[PDB]
Write an enzyme that holds these catalytic residues in place. Structure first.
Site, mmCIF file in Angstrom:
data_model
loop_
_atom_site.group_PDB
_atom_site.id
_atom_site.type_symbol
_atom_site.label_atom_id
_atom_site.label_comp_id
_atom_site.label_asym_id
_atom_site.label_seq_id
_atom_site.Cartn_x
_atom_site.Cartn_y
_atom_site.Cartn_z
ATOM 1 N N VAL A 2 0.801 -3.934 4.143
ATOM 2 C CA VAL A 2 0.663 -5.261 4.766
ATOM 3 C C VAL A 2 1.916 -6.126 4.820
ATOM 4 O O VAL A 2 1.953 -7.082 5.606
ATOM 5 C CB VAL A 2 -0.489 -6.127 4.150
ATOM 6 N N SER B 257 0.786 -1.256 0.000
ATOM 7 C CA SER B 257 0.000 0.000 0.000
ATOM 8 C C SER B 257 0.793 1.267 0.000
ATOM 9 O O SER B 257 0.251 2.313 -0.370
ATOM 10 C CB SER B 257 -0.969 0.075 1.163
ATOM 11 N N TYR C 114 -2.209 -2.217 -10.744
ATOM 12 C CA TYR C 114 -2.340 -2.106 -9.311
ATOM 13 C C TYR C 114 -1.540 -3.194 -8.589
ATOM 14 O O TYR C 114 -0.782 -2.898 -7.666
ATOM 15 C CB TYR C 114 -3.831 -2.107 -8.908
ATOM 16 N N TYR D 194 -4.554 3.086 7.746
ATOM 17 C CA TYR D 194 -5.848 2.379 7.675
ATOM 18 C C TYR D 194 -6.833 2.927 8.722
ATOM 19 O O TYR D 194 -7.157 4.111 8.706
ATOM 20 C CB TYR D 194 -5.656 0.854 7.803
ATOM 21 N N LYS E 219 0.596 3.120 -3.053
ATOM 22 C CA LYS E 219 -0.590 3.934 -3.370
ATOM 23 C C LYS E 219 -0.253 5.383 -3.366
ATOM 24 O O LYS E 219 -0.877 6.174 -4.100
ATOM 25 C CB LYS E 219 -1.770 3.657 -2.441
HETATM 26 N N1 DON Z 1 -2.044 -3.343 0.742
HETATM 27 N N2 DON Z 1 -2.277 -4.197 -0.236
HETATM 28 C C1 DON Z 1 -2.463 -5.074 -1.211
HETATM 29 C C2 DON Z 1 -3.697 -5.337 -1.800
HETATM 30 O O1 DON Z 1 -4.724 -4.773 -1.454
HETATM 31 C C3 DON Z 1 -3.760 -6.378 -2.901
HETATM 32 C C4 DON Z 1 -4.603 -7.605 -2.456
HETATM 33 C C5 DON Z 1 -3.883 -8.947 -2.718
HETATM 34 N N3 DON Z 1 -2.872 -8.728 -3.751
HETATM 35 C C6 DON Z 1 -4.833 -10.047 -3.228
HETATM 36 O O2 DON Z 1 -5.649 -9.691 -4.111
HETATM 37 O O3 DON Z 1 -4.704 -11.210 -2.749
#
Ligand code: DON
Ligand code: DON
Lengths: 306, 303
Positions: free
Chosen positions: A253, A72, A183, A235, A75
């Site tokens: 994360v 993140s 993304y 968050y 972002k």
């Molecule tokens: N902080 N973030 C990462 C995401 O939100 C991506 C979600 C993860 N790549 C998934 O879709 O399993």
């Protein structure tokens, strides 16, 4: 006892060491990110930090040089890149700055809208734009951790749901799969605490790169970025960070925290960029031991902007 | 032409910017839902800035008395913290922009009213007013008319208050809490008094005119964080991004803002602004434009 250690002689580097070693054990009270299987491999007890000053002085401690995916934290870079490309007014017509309707750029929904409005007629072009911006900041083309990317790609049901929602409601300016790719690829961009400490320093100096001596982000974009870090960066703990730490900050994360302190009227009176890494995360999604390190530094060195 | 004016500085600037922004009050309105409020001259705009050396700059309708409304929320929050301590307050109220609510919003503010020390509304308000005296240096006038018109029509707040009582977040009775909350809201102020409270917060609860610590520092920082993050209703993010000073609005058109020590105002300052015509988010329309102007021109952003 012929061999020993030395009894000695204020000092931020010494303090950072003592603090990393004290906060390291607390990782047993948090978890490594689960919903991405590749991030579940990582060692939990890791803790690293890099603080960087405009004169080039860098101090660090712990696992400051281990690679991780930005997640993140990216972002913030894609948001910056989109404002640079499209201008602030266009981005803010499609994305909210408040902590159907637009969504905040620091949450998955607004970040997906952002990836979709990057310039380029394909996922590849959007990504090259984003990497060129990244390279003006850190001085190098970022590496995609493809293991992490592919495991995100196969399990990304929630993000596909959102992206289709955003396309339904006409807040995606690109195709869903194209958007997911961009993304998920920024999220998998690699860095160490050092790289994020540098981006932090640049933002602290309103887009001015104090190493390269260039304006690299427009001042108003940098301001806007920091406002979002202060208000929406941690968050559902952003208010708590603002009240008890008081420094603009962005977590991911994987356990990164990018934080910054703008010039203010010792230590770090010219400001600084901060890069923290501690993969054990809490219930809010923020690095547990990293959050504790940052709160300690902010309280001990009085770094709060308030 | 035997008689004329003069051919040709934050004070000059402030005068010019008040004249410039005043006409924009035609794009909003004063608050309807409090009947005694929807009766004020819509075109008013005034401002006071206070430096810690005592220096004061004001332009416009700076000395017109108005009700604090939601600005009072910061004071009662501070008062509850000083009485109960921060840990007690943050168990019952959230700092995020049954569950606790945010103290800057009606629901959180009702909870705060209910935890002020004292066994009745009169004792709760007495502690509040006495905290207010240590800040502004006089006990405050209550607008009894504004109070009794708000009290007669306070369905939404009673609905909320009974909801908080049901869910166990009110440490007092409903009618008692409502009385305290509606009276704090009807405490009266000018741009000057709110400029003074803002100056004090900018100095971490240090009264720079009196030379004593009046709010504890951790309380004062927490109040500032809450203003930056929640202080401008549903426009707080926009204010953070394009203005960058901790600010708190009230629906009567007041804005309290402040700049910490960081030219002009390098020692910091408090700002009190008044502009009764409000926008869709519930903030002063022309007061907000003024504040954004000042912040951009004099580079006030704490970012
Ligand atoms: N902080 N973030 C990462 C995401 O939100 C991506 C979600 C993860 N790549 C998934 O879709 O399993
Ligand atoms: N700025 N204000 C919030 C309020 O809730 C004002 C109370 C109002 N007079 C009422 O009708 O209850």
């Amino acid at each position: 006892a012929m061999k020993e250690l030395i009894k000695e002689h204020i000092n931020p580097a010494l303090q950072l060491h003592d603090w990393v070693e004290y906060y390291r054990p607390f990782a047993a009270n948090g978890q490594s990110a689960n919903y991405i299987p590749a991030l579940g491999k990582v060692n939990d007890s890791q803790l690293g930090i890099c603080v960087l000053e405009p004169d080039g002085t860098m101090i660090h401690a712990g696992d400051w040089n281990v690679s991780f995916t930005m997640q993140s934290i990216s972002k913030v870079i894609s948001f910056i890149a989109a404002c640079m490309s499209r201008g602030i007014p266009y981005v803010l017509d499609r994305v909210d700055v408040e902590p159907g309707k637009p969504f905040n750029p620091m949450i998955n929904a607004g970040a997906l809208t952002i990836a979709s409005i990057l310039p380029g007629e394909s996922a590849y072009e959007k990504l090259e734009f984003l990497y060129s911006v990244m390279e003006t900041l850190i001085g190098k083309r970022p590496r995609i951790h493809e293991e992490v990317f592919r495991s995100e790609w196969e399990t990304a049901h929630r993000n596909r749901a959102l992206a289709y929602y955003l396309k339904e409601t006409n807040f995606l300016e690109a195709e869903v799969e194209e958007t997911l790719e961009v993304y998920l690829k920024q999220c998998a961009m690699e860095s160490t605490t050092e790289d994020i400490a540098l981006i932090g320093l640049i933002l602290a100096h309103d887009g001015y790169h104090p190493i390269r001596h260039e304006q690299v982000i427009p001042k108003d974009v940098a301001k806007l970025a920091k406002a979002l870090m202060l208000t929406c960066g941690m968050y559902n703990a952003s208010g708590k960070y603002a009240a008890f730490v008081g420094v603009p900050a962005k977590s991911g994360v994987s356990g990164g925290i990018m934080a910054l302190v703008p010039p203010s009227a010792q230590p770090f009176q010219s400001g600084c960029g901060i890069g923290i890494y501690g993969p054990a995360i809490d219930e809010y999604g923020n690095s547990l031991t990293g959050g504790m390190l940052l709160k300690h530094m902010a309280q001990e060195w009085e770094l709060s902007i308030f």
